[PDB]
Design a protein around this ligand. Structure first.
Ligand SMILES: *[C@H](O)[C@H](C[C@@H]1CCNC1=O)NC(=O)[C@H](CC(C)C)NC(=O)OCc1ccccc1
Ligand SMILES: *[C@H](O)[C@H](C[C@@H]1CCNC1=O)NC(=O)[C@H](CC(C)C)NC(=O)OCc1ccccc1
Ligand SMILES: [Ca+2]
Ligand SMILES: [Ca+2]
Ligand SMILES: [Ca+2]
Ligand SMILES: [Ca+2]
Ligand SMILES: [Ca+2]
Ligand SMILES: [Ca+2]
Lengths: 304, 304
């Protein structure tokens, strides 16, 4: 009858984390097979970071300009190249811990676990979601760049995020494992702002189905709505528009609970218009939007 | 400027988890050196679980009555004994993954990470606290017994909890790694109830200091209180009494923020009496009590 925000076990990623130093600037990298991935601003100074020109900054570096440390062990760089906003460093040694893995570009609303690291040393793990405005509400200090986000499916680690920067609002920006930013951000410490955020409607709905599956029905009602009438109230309350694709996604959960999706939208509309007036859903006083339909399914298997 | 509930990286514990089967009953065990720890109700049936007599149930078992599986590998049991509510199983093999570790009995209000496991296979990690009534607000399904809670300090894993049961309220009960229950519970599926819970005052205060350190001062005020006058309002709002020891604990945070502890109690009193009336602290609309003073310190290093 309980429901946590749960992270993937982090052991397979812990074995891949390393320290990368260039000058006085240190951050984390990801050691897979004979390659180490890390943010490219490791080659910047304090001065360079306002408006770095990475073309010209990297041509001035050699293999021995990078110092890579896996715990006590020191890795020798034999090669180096830039891929968008990442550096790819080739090392003499192939990481014997390398898990089976994929590089994936995740979509807004999707969730993943973050392994926060400092000086190449894991310090914590937590779950988060790609906001619609392409930031994540993370917990990152200096030293944290190169920390990665990932999902684990079966034996296979799907890396989806590497950490690069914090925006003035306290949220965080980064790239996929090909070094392409999520969002319209760049890895220079100029005046950048997150655009307006929105609540992830599909995820709130999924969470309401979770509440029903764990036995709570108090917010349901006898009304239904059309997609267009629901989206009218969605804009009012800054919720993402609901699409027919989202309705199809919620099919299995709708099948498991016997509550039609647009009936659950009716319920949500009622919750957005009348508040929760002192009551909780799955222990929360607010409408939660960082559980995907897919998270709800793993979390609570049967138990319906 | 952000603040997550963060779990310890789980790799050192993942390497210790195994499957233990006796009859048709399967659960997780903890493999450290040449010993496997697991809940003793693995020897019960569906029938035995109402009122097991474990003395007599265990005398009827041999070494080969237990089947222990570490992944593909099968471990041979050479020995077995009972320690309160745990079974200790001796195996031919010493776990080559065994981390440095301690067995600790944690105190109410203290936090730890849980590695939820099914069939010996880790599935998720999350942070939680020992409630004052000796339960934890976990997320556990069938198959989850033997899942463990732990803190990691330096290189050393301090195991503090092994999971045994769910109470009618949806909260969870278990033992330390010596098999002594936290709380007045027993490992029989009789009519057991959690006693009344209380909010962990020390942790809320710690969290308010966190909010100040991450730059939020809106809830502060010009008033102070005595310990006794604060505890008068604490009973009204079902908060644990504040003691002089708790005040001493909050010293470093008080020193770092310049806000005297009883001034922060004044602030908290004001928050309990006037609500938050639409405002958040560290992103929450409610007063959070599962971060210890010690968690606040690691989370946010300097940044004051
Ligand atoms: C990488 O270590 C660092 C992570 C930042 C640091 C504090 N919290 C984070 O997420 N990234 C940067 O420092 C980044 C480097 C540019 C070349 C992209 N610049 C940045 O994030 O400026 C924002 C900032 C805010 C508060 C303290 C320090 C930096
Ligand atoms: C161990 O696998 C199991 C964990 C329970 C199962 C569902 N959620 C949990 O935390 N422990 C038991 O099944 C326990 C065994 C006794 C001999 C202690 N009995 C129990 O927890 O009964 C409560 C229950 C509630 C809902 C479904 C099943 C059991
Ligand atoms: Ca680019
Ligand atoms: Ca984009
Ligand atoms: Ca319509
Ligand atoms: Ca006993
Ligand atoms: Ca006790
Ligand atoms: Ca007093």
């Amino acid at each position: 009858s309980g429901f946590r925000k749960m992270a993937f076990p982090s052991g397979k990623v812990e074995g891949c984390m390393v320290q990368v130093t260039c000058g006085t600037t240190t951050l984390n990298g990801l050691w897979l097979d004979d390659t180490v991935y890390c943010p490219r601003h490791v080659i910047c100074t304090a001065e360079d970071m306002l408006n770095p020109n990475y073309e010209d900054l990297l041509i001035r570096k050699s293999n021995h300009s990078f110092l890579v440390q896996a715990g006590n062990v020191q890795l020798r760089v034999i090669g180096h190249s830039m891929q968008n906003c990442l550096l790819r460093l080739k090392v003499d040694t192939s990481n014997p811990k390398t898990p089976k893995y994929k590089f994936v570009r995740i979509q807004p609303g999707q969730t993943f676990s973050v392994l926060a690291c400092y000086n190449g040393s894991p310090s914590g793990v937590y779950q988060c979601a790609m906001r619609p405005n392409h930031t994540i509400k993370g917990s990152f200090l200096n030293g944290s760049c190169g920390s990665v986000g990932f999902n684990i499916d079966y034996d296979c680690v799907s890396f989806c995020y590497m950490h690069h920067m914090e925006l003035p609002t306290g949220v965080h920006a980064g790239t996929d494992l090909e070094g392409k930013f999520y969002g319209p951000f760049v890895d220079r410490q100029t005046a950048q702002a997150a655009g307006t955020d929105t609540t992830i409607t599909l995820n709130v709905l999924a969470w309401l189905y979770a509440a029903v599956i764990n036995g709570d029905r108090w917010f349901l009602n006898r009304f239904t709505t059309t997609l267009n009438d629901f989206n009218l109230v969605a804009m009012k309350y800054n919720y993402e528009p609901l699409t027919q694709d989202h309705v199809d996604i919620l099919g299995p959960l709708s099948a498991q609970t016997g509550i039609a999706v647009l009936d659950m939208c009716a319920a949500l509309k009622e919750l957005l218009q009348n508040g929760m007036n002192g009551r909780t859903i799955l222990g929360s006083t607010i409408l939660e939007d960082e559980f995907t339909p897919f998270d709800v399914v793993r979390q609570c298997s049967g138990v319906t």
